[PDB]
Design a protein around this ligand. Structure first.
Ligand code: MVC
Ligand code: BGC
Lengths: 81, 81
């Protein structure tokens, strides 16, 4: 059972960044978003992805690749104003 | 080694929400933050914490409790405008 819980948790947590991507790409506004939040989160997802490759856990690699994508675009928009 | 990388990743990801908490509690502005993002993220962290209890993983429980706190504060401010 627990594995299902984990998969649903990872899915939810990864796709949650998608509406934030949508809003950032639609309104082109990033004032209220923390830069440090997405910097630290960037490095965090990077290390989770390194942990996934180190453990050859493809589901962790996938979820964190999608998250790294989302977080990267959001951070880009933040940095570029 | 891998365990260290995972722990640092969890740390980074949990503490990343702290600067967003700070900014939201100081400027009292949440316009550019996605509500749906933090809803899905909330439920995701809840399921991560349920997975930690189910696997008796105290570090997962602790990290996800701290994250649940931060995400709850941010979500509250967003829902209250
Ligand atoms: C029928 C049920 C609802 C009808 C309303 C659809 C509008 C939301 C569409 C998807 C929103 C994704 C998005 O832009 O994220 C930011 C969000 O508007 C607030 O955080
Ligand atoms: O990818 C690493 C994941 O760590 C989880 O604890 C968080 O819920 C997600 O924000 C993040 O995507």
């Amino acid at each position: 059972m627990e594995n299902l819980i984990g998969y649903v948790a990872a899915f939810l947590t990864t796709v949650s960044f998608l509406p934030q991507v949508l809003r950032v790409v639609m309104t082109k506004q990033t004032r209220d978003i923390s830069r440090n939040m997405y910097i630290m989160f960037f490095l965090g997802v990077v290390l989770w992805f390194v942990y996934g490759i180190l453990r050859s856990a493809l589901p962790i690699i996938l979820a964190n690749v999608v998250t790294l994508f989302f977080v990267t675009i959001i951070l880009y928009y933040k940095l570029t104003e």
